Amino acid sequence: MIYLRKANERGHANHGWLDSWHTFSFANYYDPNFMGFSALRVINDDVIEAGQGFGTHPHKDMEILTYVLEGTVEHQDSMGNKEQVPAGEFQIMSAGTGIRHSEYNPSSTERLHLYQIWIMPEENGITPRYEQRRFDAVQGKQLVLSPDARDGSLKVHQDMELYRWALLKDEQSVHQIAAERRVWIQVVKGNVTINGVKASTSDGLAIWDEQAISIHADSDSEVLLFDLPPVHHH
Template sequence: MINVRKASERGQADFGWLQSRHTFSFGNYYDPRYMGVSALRVINDDRVIPGQGFATHGHRDMEIISYVISGTIAHKDSYGHVKDLPAGEFQLMSAGSGIYHSEYNPSATEPLHFLQIWIQPATTGGQPEYQQKTFEQTEALTAVITPDGRDGTLRIKQDATVYRLQLADAEQLTLPLTSGRTLYLQLIKGELTLNGTQLNVGDGVSVTDEQLLSMLASEAVEALVFDLP
């Protein structure tokens, strides 16, 4: 089964300094039809104007992923991490028993565009952790986050794997699916046909009870793919 979440139908928030599009219910946006998929709870498509950002605030018991599409995030947290997160880099913050952080656009001229993603952990509590890394795209589908941190990936506290998908114009990919798993794809750039369904920038799609995924890029594609319990 393939269920498409069109970019144009997502929830919207406009705070002046922040323009956000919510794939799932978040903040003041609530739709009981879109409360998440499996352990995937939040995908916010955020655009932050220069010199602004999210002031210090707290989280607990959530795996929080940031992926920068353009611009840079300046990160600070209550465990002493002070980091810059440039475009193409992944950040994973395991909030555990509780952590405070801020995320700002440090540029005076360049907007920041990034995805903020929340995945519910398999266990609660524990020491908060911070991870950050740039990944070379070694193949069309490259793992960046895994439950065991294998092959240098970031380690998440859930039976979930996150991949970055990159396809050239007219490139095809066939992906076998594991029975009983849920897959979610969030399209960042390009146009993609997935099992005959056309996807455009910002669209998402959940996939269940399919044996194969057949993908064809109409133009160069970048997407995140979530393999979920």
């Protein structure tokens, strides 16, 4: 089973200050097939105007991950947590029992482009936490999130692993995967072929009932590989 979630068929809302593409049903947007893939519930491709952002709002039981692609984002939460995340970096927050936060573009002249990812925690009512990490760039398979925070990855309260995979043109690799585990691949940029399916910038791929993920880069690319726990008519 392999399904392509085309970039142009994503939900879309443009409020001027924010332009967002939704991979899965979000708020008032509903997609009968893409309701949420395993523990992966939200993937919003957001572009925010200089000086704008999301005012303070509450969250409960949910792991919120942010990946900045361009510009800078300023985080503030119902705590003392203040932080600026530049392009290329990640940040993660566990809403746990409850929490409020805001995110805005501190630049007074440059836009902000980021991915807002929501992961359902396998454990509910945990304690609120905020972490940020600066990984050292390097063309390879880098671990970003892990249940145990192994190999320099950030901890995530869910039986899932997230990799940032940078591939040069004509490069190729493989990722095992056992049991009834599922995989979501989001192409941040570039053109790749995965298990016989071509995908380009902003495309997503749902895969399951497979034991190996074969990836070939048709051009320099970068993908996020979500290795999700076992569990729509694609």
